[PDB]
Design an enzyme around this catalytic site. Structure first.
Site, PDB file in Angstrom:
ATOM      1  N   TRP A   1      93.024  99.553  15.188  1.00 43.44           N
ATOM      2  CA  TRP A   1      92.712  98.819  16.414  1.00 43.44           C
ATOM      3  C   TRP A   1      93.301  99.451  17.680  1.00 43.44           C
ATOM      4  O   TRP A   1      92.930  99.049  18.783  1.00 43.44           O
ATOM      5  CB  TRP A   1      93.195  97.362  16.280  1.00 43.44           C
TER       6      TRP A   1
ATOM      7  N   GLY B   1      90.158  91.714  21.111  1.00 45.12           N
ATOM      8  CA  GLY B   1      91.456  92.289  21.342  1.00 45.12           C
ATOM      9  C   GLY B   1      92.315  91.395  22.199  1.00 45.12           C
ATOM     10  O   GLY B   1      93.187  91.876  22.933  1.00 45.12           O
ATOM     11  N   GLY B   2      92.056  90.090  22.129  1.00 44.85           N
ATOM     12  CA  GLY B   2      92.823  89.132  22.907  1.00 44.85           C
ATOM     13  C   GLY B   2      92.714  89.307  24.403  1.00 44.85           C
ATOM     14  O   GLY B   2      93.544  88.766  25.134  1.00 44.85           O
TER      15      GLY B   2
ATOM     16  N   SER C   1      86.020  88.133  18.237  1.00 46.26           N
ATOM     17  CA  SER C   1      87.272  87.586  18.753  1.00 46.26           C
ATOM     18  C   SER C   1      87.166  87.386  20.268  1.00 46.26           C
ATOM     19  O   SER C   1      86.362  86.569  20.717  1.00 46.26           O
ATOM     20  CB  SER C   1      88.445  88.489  18.330  1.00 46.26           C
TER      21      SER C   1
ATOM     22  N   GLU D   1      91.133  83.847   8.799  1.00 46.94           N
ATOM     23  CA  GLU D   1      91.320  84.257  10.192  1.00 46.94           C
ATOM     24  C   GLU D   1      92.788  84.353  10.569  1.00 46.94           C
ATOM     25  O   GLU D   1      93.191  85.259  11.310  1.00 46.94           O
ATOM     26  CB  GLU D   1      90.633  83.267  11.131  1.00 46.94           C
TER      27      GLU D   1
ATOM     28  N   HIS E   1      91.143  88.392   9.905  1.00 47.75           N
ATOM     29  CA  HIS E   1      90.559  88.476  11.239  1.00 47.75           C
ATOM     30  C   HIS E   1      90.140  89.903  11.558  1.00 47.75           C
ATOM     31  O   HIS E   1      90.971  90.810  11.574  1.00 47.75           O
ATOM     32  CB  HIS E   1      91.570  87.981  12.276  1.00 47.75           C
TER      33      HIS E   1
HETATM   34  C1  LIG Z   1     103.401  88.340  24.184  1.00 46.30           C
HETATM   35  C2  LIG Z   1     102.534  88.892  23.047  1.00 46.30           C
HETATM   36  C3  LIG Z   1     101.028  89.009  23.403  1.00 46.30           C
HETATM   37  C4  LIG Z   1     100.127  88.952  22.146  1.00 46.30           C
HETATM   38  N1  LIG Z   1      98.818  89.518  22.422  1.00 46.30           N
HETATM   39  C5  LIG Z   1      97.909  89.543  21.281  1.00 46.30           C
HETATM   40  C6  LIG Z   1      96.528  90.091  21.643  1.00 46.30           C
HETATM   41  C7  LIG Z   1      95.506  89.642  20.719  1.00 46.30           C
HETATM   42  C8  LIG Z   1      94.857  90.448  19.798  1.00 46.30           C
HETATM   43  N2  LIG Z   1      93.956  89.662  19.066  1.00 46.30           N
HETATM   44  C9  LIG Z   1      94.059  88.335  19.544  1.00 46.30           C
HETATM   45  C10 LIG Z   1      93.343  87.174  19.148  1.00 46.30           C
HETATM   46  C11 LIG Z   1      93.635  85.981  19.802  1.00 46.30           C
HETATM   47  C12 LIG Z   1      94.605  85.951  20.806  1.00 46.30           C
HETATM   48  C13 LIG Z   1      95.299  87.095  21.200  1.00 46.30           C
HETATM   49  C14 LIG Z   1      95.028  88.320  20.573  1.00 46.30           C
HETATM   50  C15 LIG Z   1      98.529  90.487  20.200  1.00 46.30           C
HETATM   51  O1  LIG Z   1      98.759  91.690  20.394  1.00 46.30           O
HETATM   52  N3  LIG Z   1      98.825  89.901  18.978  1.00 46.30           N
HETATM   53  C16 LIG Z   1      99.424  90.688  17.914  1.00 46.30           C
HETATM   54  C17 LIG Z   1      98.592  90.646  16.624  1.00 46.30           C
HETATM   55  C18 LIG Z   1      97.312  91.486  16.773  1.00 46.30           C
HETATM   56  C19 LIG Z   1      96.401  91.413  15.552  1.00 46.30           C
HETATM   57  C20 LIG Z   1      96.955  92.206  14.306  1.00 46.30           C
HETATM   58  C21 LIG Z   1      96.192  93.437  13.789  1.00 46.30           C
HETATM   59  C22 LIG Z   1      94.909  93.116  13.035  1.00 46.30           C
HETATM   60  C23 LIG Z   1      94.434  91.683  13.284  1.00 46.30           C
HETATM   61  C24 LIG Z   1      93.925  91.435  14.715  1.00 46.30           C
HETATM   62  C25 LIG Z   1      94.927  91.735  15.844  1.00 46.30           C
END
Ligand SMILES: CCCCN[C@@H](Cc1c[nH]c2ccccc12)C(=O)NCCCC1CCCCCC1
Ligand SMILES: *[C@@H]1O[C@H](CO[C@@H]2O[C@@H](C)[C@@H](O)[C@@H](O)[C@@H]2O)[C@@H](O[C@@H]2O[C@H](CO)[C@@H](O)[C@H](O)[C@H]2NC(C)=O)[C@H](O)[C@H]1NC(C)=O
Ligand SMILES: *[C@@H]1O[C@H](CO)[C@@H](O[C@@H]2O[C@H](CO)[C@@H](O)[C@H](O)[C@H]2NC(C)=O)[C@H](O)[C@H]1NC(C)=O
Ligand SMILES: *[C@@H]1O[C@H](CO[C@@H]2O[C@@H](C)[C@@H](O)[C@@H](O)[C@@H]2O)[C@@H](O)[C@H](O)[C@H]1NC(C)=O
Ligand SMILES: *[C@@H]1O[C@H](CO)[C@@H](O)[C@H](O)[C@H]1NC(C)=O
Ligand SMILES: *[C@@H]1O[C@H](CO)[C@@H](O)[C@H](O)[C@H]1NC(C)=O
Ligand SMILES: *[C@@H]1O[C@H](CO)[C@@H](O)[C@H](O)[C@H]1NC(C)=O
EC number: 3.1.1.8
Length: 526
Positions: A79, A113-114, A195, A322, A435
Site C-alpha cells: 500500500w 487510503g483513509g 475504502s 474488514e 480490508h
Molecule cells: C493518527 C493516525 C492516522 C491513521 N490514518 C490511517 C489512514 C487510513 C488508511 N485506511 C483507512 C481506513 C479508514 C480510516 C483511515 C484509514 C492509517 O494509516 N491507519 C493505519 C492502518 C492502515 C491499514 C493497514 C494496512 C492494510 C490494511 C489497510 C490500511
C-alpha cells in the site's frame, strides 16, 4: 499509438496481456500542478501543450506519510507509494483495449487510503487485465490526500477544503472531454473505488457538480456515512489551527496563516500532520472531506436521508473481516506475528484505543453487545469480537445503511459480501478476509496463471470481473453464461445480498442485522 486530446497529443505504449495487446497511457496530466501560490487551492484547468506528451510511465504520487509500522513486510508496503512523491502529482492513466474500441464503457478507479495515503500506480490497481478481458476502458487518477488535499478554513478559497475531491472531479471532467478520442463512451462511465475511494464515489453521488460526469457507481468497503469519512467543521478548524501552531504559522488574519503554510516544505507539512488529532486511532482521518458549501452543500447524512443524490444504480459491498487489519496498529495484545489471543481486559483497553473520546457507558455498551457468547471458554472470543467491533462500526453497517437509504428512493442496488481469503495473503490467518484484499480479485490479477493463485481463485476473479463489467455496461451485475446464481436487487424490505467465494455463491438476507441495529440506531446517541 498517438492520441490527439483537447490539450495536446499523448503517446502511449503497447502491452502484452494474455496473448493479446492493451494500450496504456500512463501519467497524463489533467491539471496545473498545484505548486507555490496554488498549493491548497482548487485544481486549475490545464492549458495546451506543444509536442507529444510521453505517457509511458506512472507519474509522481502525491505527498503523504508512509506506513513504516512493518518495514519489509509486503502486506503493508504493497500500500505504500511505488513512485516518487511530489506535490506535482495531478495525473491520470488510461488503459484502452487493442484494437482500439469504438464506444467502450469506461471504468474509473478512485483509490482509498483513509484520504491520507494512496496512489493510482499500485500493482493491485493495474487496469490492463480488465481492458484485455472485458474490453472496457479503465481510467485512474491521483488526487491530493492529507493536508495538501483536505485542509480547510471553510469559505476561504485559499484553503476551502475538499481539494482532493475536486481533483477527482476534474479528472472525471477530463474523461468527459477526451475519452471519445481514446475510443470510450463518455455517456457510459462507472466510478468505482475502495475504502476512502468508495466514500469518494458516494460523495460524488451527492455532489451536483459531478452528477453529469458519470452514470453508475460501485462502492467497495466504503461510504460517506462511515464514522471516519467526513471531518466536522468544528474539527476541521481545530486541526488546521493545530497545524498552524505546530509550524509556528499561527496568525489572526486567517489568510496570512495559509500564506505562511505555503512557504513550509512539503515534509515539514507532512511531519506535523500526525499530531493534529488529540487522540489518534488506527482509523484516524487527519484531514478529510468537509461540508465546504461548494462540493458538499449540506451535511451528507441529511442529503442521503432526504433523497438528494444522483438517481442511478449502485453496487455496494464489504469484506468479511474488514476490521482485523487495524487491530495490529495499536490494539494491546495484538500482533501480525502470533494468533493474538487477548483477554477480557485487553479487549476493554482496546476499546479505549478505538473509541477514545467515548463515555465510559458507551464503551460498556459495546462490550455488552459483543461479549454475549454462545461459548464462554473459547480462547479467541475477545480477539474475534474486537475485530468485528471495528469492522461493523467502521465499514459494514455504514455500507448497509447507505444501501438501504439509497434504494429507498427507487434505484436498483446490489450488495455483495466478499468472504474469500486470498491464498497469497501475507497477513496471518486469524486476520481473515481483510480490508482491501478483494481489489486484486476485482482487477483480474488471479487471471495471471503465472503468479501462484489457486485455480478456484482464477474462476472467482473471472466471475467478479464479468459481474463488475456487466454492471458498468448494463447496470446489471449478472454472469449470464455459466449458469451462475442470479444476483438479486437489494430492497429495504428483503435486504438480499450476494456472497462471493470459491465454494458456493449463496443469496442471503439481512447481513449483521443484530450488530447493525446497535451501531446505527442505539450507538449514535452516546
Ligand atoms: C493518527 C493516525 C492516522 C491513521 N490514518 C490511517 C489512514 C487510513 C488508511 N485506511 C483507512 C481506513 C479508514 C480510516 C483511515 C484509514 C492509517 O494509516 N491507519 C493505519 C492502518 C492502515 C491499514 C493497514 C494496512 C492494510 C490494511 C489497510 C490500511
Ligand atoms: C502476541 O504478541 C504480542 C505482541 O508481540 C510481542 O511484542 C514484542 C514486545 C515482543 O515480545 C515480540 O516477541 C512480540 O511480537 C504479545 O503482547 C505482549 O505480551 C506480553 C503481555 O501480554 C508483553 O510482552 C507485552 O506487554 C505485550 N505487547 C505489547 C504491550 O506490545 C502477546 O502476549 C502475544 N500473545 C500470544 C498468545 O502469543
Ligand atoms: C481541539 O484542539 C485543541 C487545541 O487547539 C485541543 O486542546 C488541547 O487538548 C489536549 C487535551 O485534550 C491538551 O493538549 C490541552 O489541554 C489542550 N490545549 C489547549 C491549548 O487548550 C483540544 O483537545 C481539542 N478539543 C477537544 C478535544 O474538545
Ligand atoms: C518522447 O518519445 C519519443 C519516442 O520514443 C521512441 O520510442 C520509445 C519506446 C523509446 O524506444 C525511445 O528511445 C524512442 O525514440 C522520443 O523519440 C522522444 O525523444 C521523447 N521526447 C520526450 C520529450 O520525452
Ligand atoms: C455511443 O453510444 C451512445 C449511447 O450510449 C450514443 O449516443 C453515441 O452516439 C455512440 N457513439 C458512437 C457509437 O461513436
Ligand atoms: C488581512 O485581512 C483583511 C481582512 O481582515 C483582508 O482584507 C486582507 O486581504 C488580509 N490580508 C491579505 C494579505 O490579503
Ligand atoms: C465460463 O466457463 C469457462 C469454462 O467452461 C471459462 O473458461 C470462462 O472463463 C467462464 N466465463 C466466465 C465469464 O466466468
Amino acid at each position: 499509438i498517438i492520441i490527439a486530446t483537447k490539450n495536446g497529443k499523448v503517446r502511449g505504449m503497447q502491452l502484452t496481456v494474455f496473448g493479446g495487446t492493451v494500450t496504456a497511457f500512463l501519467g497524463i496530466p489533467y491539471a496545473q500542478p498545484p505548486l507555490g501560490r496554488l498549493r491548497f487551492k482548487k485544481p486549475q484547468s490545464l492549458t495546451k501543450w506543444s509536442d507529444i506528451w510521453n505517457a509511458t510511465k506512472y507519474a509522481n504520487s502525491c505527498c503523504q506519510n508512509i506506513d513504516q509500522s512493518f518495514p519489509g513486510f509486503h502486506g503493508s508496503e504493497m500500500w505504500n507509494p511505488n513512485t516518487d512523491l511530489s506535490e506535482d502529482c495531478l495525473y491520470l492513466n488510461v488503459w484502452i483495449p487493442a484494437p482500439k474500441p469504438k464506444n467502450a464503457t469506461v471504468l474509473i478507479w478512485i483509490y482509498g487510503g483513509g484520504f491520507q495515503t494512496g496512489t493510482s500506480s499500485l500493482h493491485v490497481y493495474d487496469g490492463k487485465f480488465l481492458a484485455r478481458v472485458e474490453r472496457v476502458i479503465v481510467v485512474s487518477m491521483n488526487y491530493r490526500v492529507g493536508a495538501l488535499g483536505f485542509l480547510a478554513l471553510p469559505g476561504n478559497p485559499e484553503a476551502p477544503g475538499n481539494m482532493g475531491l475536486f481533483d477527482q472531479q476534474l479528472a472525471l471532467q477530463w474523461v468527459q472531454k477526451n475519452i471519445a478520442a481514446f475510443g470510450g463512451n463518455p455517456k457510459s462511465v462507472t466510478l468505482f473505488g475502495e475504502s476512502a475511494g468508495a466514500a469518494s464515489v458516494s460523495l460524488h453521488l451527492l455532489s451536483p457538480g459531478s452528477h453529469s460526469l458519470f452514470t453508475r457507481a460501485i462502492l467497495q468497503s466504503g461510504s460517506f456515512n462511515a464514522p471516519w469519512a467526513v471531518t466536522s467543521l468544528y474539527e476541521a478548524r481545530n486541526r488546521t489551527l493545530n497545524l498552524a501552531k505546530l509550524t509556528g504559522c499561527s496568525r489572526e488574519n486567517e489568510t496570512e496563516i495559509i500564506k505562511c503554510l505555503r512557504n513550509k516544505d512539503p515534509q515539514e507539512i507532512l511531519l506535523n500532520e500526525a499530531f493534529v488529532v488529540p487522540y489518534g486511532t488506527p482509523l484516524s482521518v487527519n484531514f478529510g472531506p468537509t461540508v465546504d458549501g461548494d462540493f458538499l452543500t449540506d451535511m451528507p447524512d441529511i442529503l442521503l436521508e432526504l433523497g438528494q443524490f444522483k438517481k442511478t444504480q449502485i453496487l455496494v459491498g464489504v469484506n468479511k473481516d474488514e476490521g482485523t487489519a487495524f487491530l495490529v496498529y495499536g490494539a494491546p495484545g495484538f500482533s501480525k506475528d502470533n494468533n493474538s489471543i487477548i483477554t477480557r481486559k485487553e479487549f476493554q483497553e482496546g476499546l479505549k484505543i478505538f473509541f477514545p473520546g467515548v463515555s465510559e457507558f458507551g464503551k460498556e455498551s459495546i462490550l455488552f453487545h459483543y461479549t454475549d457468547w454462545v461459548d464462554d471458554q473459547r480462547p479467541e472470543n475477545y480477539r474475534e469480537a474486537l475485530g468485528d467491533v471495528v469492522g461493523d462500526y467502521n465499514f459494514i453497517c455504514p455500507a448497509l445503511e447507505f444501501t438501504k437509504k439509497f434504494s429507498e428512493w427507487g434505484n436498483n442496488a446490489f450488495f455483495y459480501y466478499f468472504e474469500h481469503r486470498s491464498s497469497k495473503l501475507p497477513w496471518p490467518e486469524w486476520m481473515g478476509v481483510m480490508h482491501g484484499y478483494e481489489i486484486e480479485f476485482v482487477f483480474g490479477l488471479p487471471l495471471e496463471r503465472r503468479d501462484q493463485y489457486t485455480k478456484a481463485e482464477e474462476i472467482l476473479s473471472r466471475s467478479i470481473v464479468k459481474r463488475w463489467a456487466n454492471f458498468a455496461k448494463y447496470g446489471n451485475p449478472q454472469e449470464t453464461q455459466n449458469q451462475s446464481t442470479s444476483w438479486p436487487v437489494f430492497k429495504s424490505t428483503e435486504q438480499k445480498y450476494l456472497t462471493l467465494n470459491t465454494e458456493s455463491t449463496r443469496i442471503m438476507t439481512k447481513l449483521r442485522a443484530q450488530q447493525c441495529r446497535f451501531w446505527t440506531s442505539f450507538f449514535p446517541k452516546v
